[PDB]
Amino acid sequence: FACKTANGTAIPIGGGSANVYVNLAPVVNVGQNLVVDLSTQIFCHNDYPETITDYVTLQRGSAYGGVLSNFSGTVKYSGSSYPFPTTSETPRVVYNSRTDKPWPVALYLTPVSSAGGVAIKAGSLIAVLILRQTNNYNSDDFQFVWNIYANNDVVVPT
């Protein structure tokens, strides 16, 4: 089991860390969602599906910088909604193919009423998301840590 980003940055068997740089809608009004769709950015696969079934959760999601201070967050994992920053590990999604499959995570970030002006700064860390991978075969329990960075400033109009 291993994963990669849309630009080919890999985290190999056994886990590890990678940075993911995302373009963000540059203007987001109070009452709208800023959507960070990681399912187009992070992909994973099973290396031995003949024998092993892989299980994958979002173990934790943490907010940083302007997302921590200026937004109210929800994460969707395989379509189901949970608070972000997270309060529990999600259910498991099965990976049973060598073909790359999206990691089905998206963040929905809506401005808090006090937000105004530059609410996220270009180049800043906005989230750390931990993918936890286990299987039905041995004791492997690995973390794939995704550090999510903003490519651009985001303004909440005033």
Ligand X SMILES: CC(=O)c1cnc(N[C@H]2O[C@H](CO)[C@@H](O)[C@H](O)[C@@H]2O)s1
Determine if 1 is a binding residue for ligand X (CB under 6 A).
Answer: yes
Residue 10 interacts with ligand X (CB under 6 A): yes or no: no
Q: Among residues 70, 72, 58, which one has the least CA distance to residue 128?
A: 58
Residues 121-150 that bind ligand X (CB under 6 A): 135, 140
Say whether residue 94 binds ligand X (CB under 6 A): no
In the complex, the smallest distance separating the C-beta of residue 3 from ligand X, rounded to whole angstroms, is: 10
CB-hemisphere CA count at 13 Å for 7? 6
Catalogue the long-range contacts made by 140-143 (C-beta closer than 8 Å, 24 or more residues apart): 142/1, 142/14, 142/15, 143/15, 143/59
Residue 47 sits in the site that holds ligand X (CB under 6 A): yes
Instruction: Give the length of the chain.
Output: 158
Binding of residue 70 to ligand X (CB under 6 A):
no
Interacting residues with ligand X (CB under 6 A): 1, 13, 46-48, 52, 54, 135, 140
